[PDB]
Write a protein that binds this ligand. Sequence first.
Ligand SMILES: C[C@@H]1CCCCCCCOc2cc(cc(C(=O)N(C)C)c2)C(=O)N[C@H]([C@@H](O)CO)C1
Length: 369
Amino acid sequence: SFVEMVDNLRGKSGQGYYVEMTVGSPPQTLNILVDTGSSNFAVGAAPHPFLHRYYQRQLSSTYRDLRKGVYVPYTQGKWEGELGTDLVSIPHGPNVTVRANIAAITESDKFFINGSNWEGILGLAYAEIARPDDSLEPFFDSLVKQTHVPNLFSLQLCGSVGGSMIIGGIDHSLYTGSLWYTPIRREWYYEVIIVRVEINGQDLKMDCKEYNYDKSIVDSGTTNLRLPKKVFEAAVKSIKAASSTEKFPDGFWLGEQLVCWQAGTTPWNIFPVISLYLMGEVTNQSFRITILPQQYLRPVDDCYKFAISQSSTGTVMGAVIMEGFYVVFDRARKRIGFAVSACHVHDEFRTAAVEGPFVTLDMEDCGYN
Ligand SMILES: C[C@@H]1CCCCCCCOc2cc(cc(C(=O)N(C)C)c2)C(=O)N[C@H]([C@@H](O)CO)C1
């Protein structure tokens, strides 16, 4: 029954992927950003220069006030609002209606994006990071509790942009080859363990704890591949070395300045592939996902921003990593699956890949404590 959900995501490049939802009775239609990096369902509920529409609680007969405030801070942006519940549906999702917690956004700072076309956020991570505390049941938890929807969803993000959120299962027509699974280390963010990193086939040869300092997560609501400082410096050094044929402004490597080439002449071959090895399902076993330069040079002649950046809160496998892969958030089995997507990245001599099995010893040592 998943065909109805294929292509149910839209977006603008670097501005997030959103799905259409309705809230309230009679249904009010809103576009909702899909965020695996948070756990609150929230919608604009008051005028804002960047909102073309918003939730009007007064017009919904099923709205209930919870008489509690809430604020959610993100890496970029924050908002505050009023908690309540209402009936919610997903037109190009399962044919169900659930009563869900909703934060009505009344004030915000650097959260809404001019021209993004979305008005709210669907936090798909676990209750442990919900605000104000873990007693506020996240939307997907409510969906699973109140309906027969199985406890998993998958995201196919395609690189103006589109994709699919398959709610309740896996659509096998959306990927090729095999799915490779990595354990969800802890149910808060979608936390995973990276056990090895290679650039153009050369191991970065860092203590693998550095890759997960202080966590590694999969976040559809972040654009970039974000790496801890020490890992970021090693990777940039290696990427600079591979592309030293051409020289780039020092601000290019920091994400500030874009770089351009005559349309159709981008020198893809001078930028390396990056392989992230993830902890596998059996003892001493890993697999790798390989990322092409067409993913981490984000298009904005042909002009691009460097979409690998530094983090002080751990690795973030953002949208440019997820794009081109079919990603299964298998909550029921506490694992995340990766496969090559039907909308994969096309290089003439290279290809994005999900490959295994690999043997990797002492993978438990790669987790940060
Ligand atoms: C607020 C987000 C949803 C609206 C924005 C979606 C489009 C922009 C995605 O690009 C970024 C988003 C976030 C952080 C960065 C970043 O690396 N820097 C240095 C600011 C870039 C961010 O905070 N993402 C969060 C949530 O997923 C993590 O907390 C969700």
